[PDB]
């Protein structure tokens, strides 16, 4: 199951989120820092 | 196929694209002799002696363009090698039939034969070679029957033109002119296009060895890359330093490594026959390089690199990566020169005139070992 899931995930790279896709993706650390900033800023976090 | 960059590129990615396998030739169905597409050959005019070549022995880019008939050692040099390329991508390696259009490309220069109404035969560049001027056909008889071309078959076809035995007349597809000798009075006889020509205009075909074709293509590629390197060094010099100029440092390094591997001497533990064959191949490569003038190119590159007194100086004038690669490229160039001239009496006798210039730079640390090795081989 692990091998099958890894193979399907690498066939469809969009399952990794906006980051880790490449072609402009920032990265895990940058994405998590952006999430920290989103949590710190109320407006982009809640429906408002 | 990747669209990330502007120019089309191919890479191994998890995205998939569609490929088509188009056949070219089948080895089994190809026959002994019996000229096929993509062949590298020589055009022989008279008693198997004159060959259609270009005056490339005395340098001169303008003199590369002219085409003539010459005899002697040109029949074994690389200046008389022509690749016959069909106009169809699919089955381009098929047998060549009478009247089938094709292009003749000079292997050493990479240029294509062509006919301009004002300056007869001429070699032009790939960009300007546009079928209408570069298409030629082989005809069995000078009589202009002009039946036409048949339906392009998808396969090896039928073998018609045979090496040596067959007599071929070269005809321009559009104008219909036949290739003829101008007979202007080492023959050095100009070749022209004439509407009727002479009766002894038969041209025979002599195939070239795979080693000869490989060496000629290597010569062309090395000449191109080393001329680019020399132009880059010249642009960096003359107090015209700028980052606009391109310096193919990694390309030159890899090409030098490949050339050293190409001219590496045969291994000792091999069998006697294999060692003799490899020695013969190495000697043929050295002779072809010498006839094309590669030693002079290496000497020019070494001289243009020696104007810099240190790797730090070369880095200051060109860039840091050039700084680290300067000493390595100099050592590789000296090793290439030593391999080129090693064991070749003719090559060393030709190099005899350059020993003074070579010895003039013994005191330099970066070149002492290479100059000493070259001098030892020559002496």
Curated annotation (Swiss-Prot), chain B:
Post-translational modification remark: Channel activity is modulated by phosphorylation. Phosphorylation is increased in failing heart, leading to calcium leaks and increased cytoplasmic Ca(2+) levels.
Tissue spec: Detected in heart muscle (at protein level). Heart muscle, brain (cerebellum and hippocampus) and placenta.
Domain MIR: 32-87, 93-150, 158-208
Inducing stimuli: By TGFB1.
Organism superkingdom: Eukaryota
Subcellular location: Sarcoplasmic reticulum membrane
UniProt note: domains: The calcium release channel activity resides in the C-terminal region while the remaining part of the protein resides in the cytoplasm.
Subunit structure: Homotetramer. Can also form heterotetramers with RYR1 and RYR3. Interacts with FKBP1A and FKBP1B; these interactions may stabilize the channel in its closed state and prevent Ca(2+) leaks. Interacts with CALM and S100A1; these interactions regulate channel activity. Identified in a complex composed of RYR2, FKBP1B, PKA catalytic subunit, PRKAR2A, AKAP6, and the protein phosphatases PP2A and PP1. Interacts directly with FKBP1B, PKA, PP1 and PP2A. Interacts with SELENON. In cardiac muscles, identified in a complex, composed of FSD2, CMYA5 and RYR2.
Task of the protein: Cytosolic calcium-activated calcium channel that mediates the release of Ca(2+) from the sarcoplasmic reticulum into the cytosol and thereby plays a key role in triggering cardiac muscle contraction. Aberrant channel activation can lead to cardiac arrhythmia. In cardiac myocytes, calcium release is triggered by increased Ca(2+) cytosolic levels due to activation of the L-type calcium channel CACNA1C. The calcium channel activity is modulated by formation of heterotetramers with RYR3. Required for cellular calcium ion homeostasis. Required for embryonic heart development.
Family that this chain belongs to: Belongs to the ryanodine receptor (TC 1.A.3.1) family. RYR2 subfamily.
Record's disease association: Ventricular tachycardia, catecholaminergic polymorphic, 1, with or without atrial dysfunction and/or dilated cardiomyopathy: An arrhythmogenic disorder characterized by stress-induced, bidirectional ventricular tachycardia that may degenerate into cardiac arrest and cause sudden death. Patients present with recurrent syncope, seizures, or sudden death after physical activity or emotional stress. CPVT1 inheritance is autosomal dominant. Ventricular arrhythmias due to cardiac ryanodine receptor calcium release deficiency syndrome: An autosomal dominant arrhythmogenic disorder characterized by syncope, cardiac arrest and/or sudden unexpected death, often in association with physical exertion or acute emotional stress. Patients who survive manifest polymorphic ventricular tachycardia and ventricular fibrillation. Unlike typical catecholaminergic ventricular tachycardia, arrhythmias are not reproducible on exercise stress testing or adrenaline challenge.
Protein's UniProt name: Ryanodine receptor 2
Residues of the full protein shown: 194 to 579 of 4967
């Amino acid at each position: 199951n692990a091998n099958v899931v890894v193979r399907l995930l690498i066939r469809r790279p969009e399952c990794f989120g906006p980051a880790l896709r490449g072609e402009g993706g920032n990265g895990l650390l940058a994405a998590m820092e952006e999430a920290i900033k989103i949590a710190e800023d109320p407006s982009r976090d809640g429906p408002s | 196929l990747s669209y990330g960059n502007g120019s089309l590129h191919v890479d191994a990615a998890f995205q998939q694209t569609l490929w088509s396998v188009a056949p070219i030739s089948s080895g089994s169905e190809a026959a002994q002799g019996y000229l096929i597409g993509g062949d590298v050959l020589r055009l022989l005019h008279g008693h198997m002696d004159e060959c259609l070549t270009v005056p490339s022995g005395e340098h001169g880019e303008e003199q590369r363009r002219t085409v003539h008939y010459e005899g002697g050692a040109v029949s074994v040099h690389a200046r008389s090698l022509w690749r016959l390329e069909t106009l169809r991508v699919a089955w381009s390696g098929s047998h060549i039939r009478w009247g089938q259009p094709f292009r003749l490309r000079h292997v050493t220069t990479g240029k294509y034969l062509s006919l301009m109404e004002d300056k007869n035969l001429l070699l032009m560049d790939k960009e300007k070679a546009d079928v209408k001027s570069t298409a030629f056909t082989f005809r069995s008889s000078k009589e202009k029957l002009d039946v036409g071309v048949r339906k392009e078959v998808d396969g090896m076809g039928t073998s018609e033109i045979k090496y040596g035995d067959s007599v071929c007349y070269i005809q321009h597809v559009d104008t219909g002119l036949w290739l003829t000798y101008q007979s202007v009075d080492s023959i050095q006889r100009k070749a022209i296009m004439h509407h009727e020509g002479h009766m002894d205009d038969g041209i025979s075909l002599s195939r070239s060895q795979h080693e000869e074709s490989r060496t000629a293509r290597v010569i062309r590629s090395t000449v191109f890359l080393f001329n680019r390197f020399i132009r880059g060094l010249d642009a960096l010099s003359k107090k015209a330093k700028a980052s606009t100029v391109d310096l193919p440092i990694e390309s030159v390094s890899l090409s030098l490594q490949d050339l050293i591997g190409y001219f590496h001497p045969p291994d000792e533990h091999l069998e006697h026959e294999d060692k003799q064959n490899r020695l013969r191949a190495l000697k043929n490569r050295q002779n072809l390089f010498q006839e094309e003038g590669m030693i002079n190119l290496v000497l020019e590159c070494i001289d243009r690199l020696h104007v810099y007194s240190s790797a730090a100086h070369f880095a200051d004038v060109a860039g840091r990566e050039a700084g680290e690669s300067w000493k390595s490229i100099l050592n590789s160039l000296y090793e290439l020169l030593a391999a080129l001239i090693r064991g070749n009496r003719k090559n060393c006798a030709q190099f005899s005139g350059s020993l003074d210039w070579l010895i003039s730079r013994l005191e330099r640390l970066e070149a002492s070992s290479g100059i000493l090795e070259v001098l030892h081989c020559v002496l």
